[PDB]
Amino acid sequence: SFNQFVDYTLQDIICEDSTLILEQLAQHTTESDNISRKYEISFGKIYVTKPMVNESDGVTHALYPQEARLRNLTYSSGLFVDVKTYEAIDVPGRELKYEDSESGKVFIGRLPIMLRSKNCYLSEATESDLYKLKECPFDMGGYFIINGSEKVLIAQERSAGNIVQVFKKAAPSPISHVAEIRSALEKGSRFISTLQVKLYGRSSARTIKATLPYIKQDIPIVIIFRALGIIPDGEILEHICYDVNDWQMLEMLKPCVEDGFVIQDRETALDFIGRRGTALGIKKEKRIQYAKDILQKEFLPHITQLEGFESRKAFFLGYMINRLLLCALDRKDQDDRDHFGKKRLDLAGPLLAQLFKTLFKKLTKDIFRYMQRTVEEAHDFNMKLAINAKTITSGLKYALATGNWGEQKKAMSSRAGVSQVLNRYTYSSTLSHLRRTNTPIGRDGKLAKPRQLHNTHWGLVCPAETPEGQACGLVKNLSLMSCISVGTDPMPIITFLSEWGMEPLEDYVPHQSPDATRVFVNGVWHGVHRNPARLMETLRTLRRKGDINPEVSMIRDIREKELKIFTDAGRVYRPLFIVEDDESLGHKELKVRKGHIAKLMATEYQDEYTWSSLLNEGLVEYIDAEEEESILIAMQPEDLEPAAKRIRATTFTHCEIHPSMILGVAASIIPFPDHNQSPRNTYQSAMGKQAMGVFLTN
């Protein structure tokens, strides 16, 4: 997580908002003219340093973890970034063509570093050199050193965004079925932008209304479709219903069609007020320009937000309406909030990203200040950034030391459990404190929600290593091989998909596609395809060949005629053996053979196959928590592969590498956990961390 946050997401977060200009042309017409006094400042490449800290009145030392640890330092390193007039002039008539550094790589602050990260001294040490530096070689683990105290951050699980969900609200309320969408931009302005559509009446007031910012009335969806640019009602019907043969949905839509029977033009529908403010600018009643700017810039911050993709919005909204309508028609059941796959695990990367974004916005706002102040001479470019560096470093230090998460905002929105102090009693405990999770639910707690274990938790989170009391079922612990998703750019994937034959939704038509399959990527609809099978196998083969980052996961919901692609960051996945159904030797067989494992043993005893070297040639494949709903698993490599102690289909695709690996760190110590009652195993898992012994060697 940290390595990703350092290599990228930092140059990105800067080059994204590296624009700031004060071109004081004349601040009023003329003044003849005057010159376009551009004050252009922009940030180029950034730089990072090794931990390099000077004391008072002295030279800078090359730090080392033990040095900071005993001297109560912060094992951080500094930063400095490059900073970048020639004009265009215009008196009034003509116009529309009327459009600095003072230093280089100016210091901007210092930020803490992850131990044994890419830029940590220890990440290259040899055991001899490692002892020369005097720290235990068993100290595998990325904690933090703040003011001389080992410091650890903990994962925060959250519901995944940009994904359709439906709920059945309680009977007394005039809403019976609701669908909600969350959104984000990673993570400008936080772009919460909740979208929700409510189904009214039981009463038989069957009508569908939607809530959109900044419109403060419930709006009939037909008006929304018309305002988007779809006038003829039949087209709107085509956007909701897909099997023209079926009718029921049309019957329940009938009242909704009746509601919008009065308006018949797109801008007239746009002319609806939905005021909510702000102060009415140029207006007659409501600018059509205002409405369209809303619907483009702010509406649905996912699939697109620029100017010109009304049709994509229409199709996605119709899809969501259809999903809502199914739940009211009982064709498909209620959504499951507590299913694990539709959650994510925010980690060090994203958290540091959030804090850095906030503090850098504060930075930029302060930069604008004292530049407008210097109406007279001159451009500083030097000294204000020193106080700015103090601010950035102080903010990072405070966040990582206090546990509050955010600036000094009087503990607003500051969930404290983010920067707990690392436990150091037993090596078992220490390891059992790194791979740790936490979610906010409440103070006291409910008793029908995720506290109890879930089926989806299989093989991802240890089913016994939990604390008890007021937090039971909240804190949970990753299983052994479970790994987290660091995300990847989807653009190459979508370009490849389009190249291999895609129907862009701009020219989709249900009539000519009575069986074609929808395609989703990170919860964005992009197109529809005829043959899903060949595309599925091709993507699978290309992944296995190693031409796509294996973290990517795809699912073909053949029952729902759907295809999903996921490449976000924060998913949880586990390894698995791949099983080829075909076999020249006969029935069925998992692809790996004895030669590969012999090579593995030879490589190990050499003191050149790696796990990666197993991955490339297609022998094991990562599986996220979402896919399992489309895979059959064989517990034993011989359970049914061919044709007293204890009690012991033919379409397997993957076999578990070993069952005993569903545990976590602490439970692994328990001998024969099968042969005793589960709560007793939980008692031991919790208790073992309270045992003495050794914790390091140094």
Report the interface residues with DNA, using CB under 7 A: 146-147, 149, 151, 174, 182, 189-190, 192-194, 213, 398, 401-402, 413, 421, 440-444, 446
Minimum CB–partner distance for residue 460 and other proteins (Å): 12
CB of residue 538 to DNA, shortest distance in Å: 38
Question: In the complex with DNA, which residue's Cβ is closer, 372 or 650?
Answer: 372
Q: Which residue, chain included where needed, has tokens 């951080």? A: 76
Specify the residue, 65 or 260, whose C-beta has the smaller distance to other proteins: 260
- Interaction partner, residue 50 (DNA, other proteins, none; CB < 5-8 Å by kind): none
- Residue 187, preceding bond cis, omega within 30 degrees? yes
Diameter over CA atoms, the chain: 103
257: partner contacted, choices other proteins, DNA, none (Cβ within 5-8 A by kind): other proteins
Chain centroid to Cα 697, Å, comes to 38
CB of residue 413 vs DNA: minimum separation in angstroms?
5
Q: Give the nearest distance from C-beta 29 to other proteins in angstroms.
A: 10
Extract the tokens encoding 595: 């030669």
Minimum distance from residue 441 beta carbon to DNA (Å): 6
SS3 of residue 419 by DSSP? coil
Min dist. Cβ of residue 696 to other proteins (A): 33
Cβ closer to other proteins: 352 or 464? Answer: 464
Listing DSSP states for 351-380 in one string gives HHHHHHHHHHHHHHHHHHTTTSS-SSS---
Answer yes or no: are the C-beta atoms of 474 and 455 closer than 8 Å.
Answer: no
- The site partner of 309 among DNA, other proteins, none (C-beta below 5 to 8 Å per kind) is other proteins
Query: Which amino acid makes up residue 600?
Result: L
Strand bridging mode 654-655 / 633-634: parallel
DSSP assignment string, 3-26: HHHHHSSSHHHHHHT-EEE--BS-
- Nearest-angstrom CA–CA distance, 296 and 288: 12
- Residue 147 binds: one of DNA, other proteins, none (C-beta under 5 to 8 A by kind): DNA
For residue 297, the minimal CB distance to other proteins (Å) is 11
Nearest to 576 by CA among 616, 621, 617, 541: 621
The owner of tokens 């030797």 is: 585
Cis peptide before 278 (omega within 30 of 0): yes
201 binds, among other proteins, DNA, none (CB under 5 to 8 A by kind): none
Q: Which is nearer to DNA, 254 or 424 (by Cβ)?
A: 424
Q: How far is the CB of 468 from other proteins (least distance, A)?
A: 6
Contact 519, 528 (CB under 8 A): yes
Residue 563 CB, nearest distance to other proteins (Å)? 12
98 binds, among DNA, other proteins, none (CB under 5 to 8 A by kind): none
Considering beta carbons, is residue 74 or 305 the nearer one to other proteins? Answer: 305
Cβ-Cβ contacts under 8 Å for 257 (sequence gap 6 or more) = 222, 233, 236, 237
Of 422 and 657, CB closest to DNA = 422
Binds 39: which of DNA, other proteins, none (CB < 5-8 Å by kind): none
Nearest to 158 by CA among 377, 354, 447: 354
| Between 243 and 608, CB nearer to other proteins | 243
Task: Report in angstroms how near the CB of residue 174 gets to DNA at its nearest.
Answer: 7
Cβ neighbors of 162 (< 8 A, separation 6 or more) are 181, 182, 183, 184, 302, 522, 523, 524
Token pair belonging to 372: 């407008």
**Beta carbon of residue 38, minimum distance to other proteins (angstroms, whole number):** 12
Q: Which does 11 bind (CB under 5 to 8 A by kind): DNA, other proteins, none?
A: none
C-alpha angle with apex 491: 487 to 493, nearest 5 degrees? 80
CA neighbours closer than 13 Å in the CB half-sphere of residue 459: 20
Partner from other proteins, DNA, none binding residue 447, C-beta < 5-8 Å depending on class: other proteins
What's the one-letter identity of residue 395?
G
Instruction: Pick what 442 binds: DNA, other proteins, none; C-beta below 5 to 8 Å, kind-dependent.
Output: DNA
Does the bond joining 94 to the residue before it have cis omega, within 30 degrees of 0? yes
The one of DNA, other proteins, none whose footprint includes residue 422, by CB under 5 to 8 A per kind, is none
By beta-carbon proximity to other proteins, the closer residue of 331 and 587 is 331
Nearest to 88 by CA among 30, 33, 29: 33
Our CB check for other proteins shows the closer of 267 and 338 to be: 267
Based on CB atoms, which residue is closest to other proteins, 54 or 531? 531
313-325 in b/e form (b: 16+ CB < 10 A) is bbbbbbbbbebbb
In the complex with DNA, which residue's Cβ is closer, 407 or 557? 407
Q: Which is nearer to other proteins, 250 or 602 (CB)?
A: 250
Q: 293 vs 537, which CB is nearer to DNA?
A: 293
Write the CB contacts of 212 (distance below 8 Å, at least 6 apart in sequence): 195, 219, 224, 274, 294, 299
Distance CA 493, CA 607 (A): 39
595 binds, among DNA, other proteins, none (CB under 5 to 8 A by kind): none
d(CA 539, CA 543): 6
With CB under 5 to 8 Å by kind, the binding choice for 332 among other proteins, DNA, none is other proteins
Closest approach of other proteins to the CB of residue 373, in Å: 10
Residue 146 binding: pick among other proteins, DNA, none (C-beta 5-8 Å cut-off by kind)? DNA
What one-letter code names the amino acid at 350?
A: P
Nearer to other proteins, 70 or 491 (CB): 491
CB of 521 to other proteins, least distance (A): 16
User: Shortest distance, CB of residue 626 to other proteins, whole angstroms?
Assistant: 12
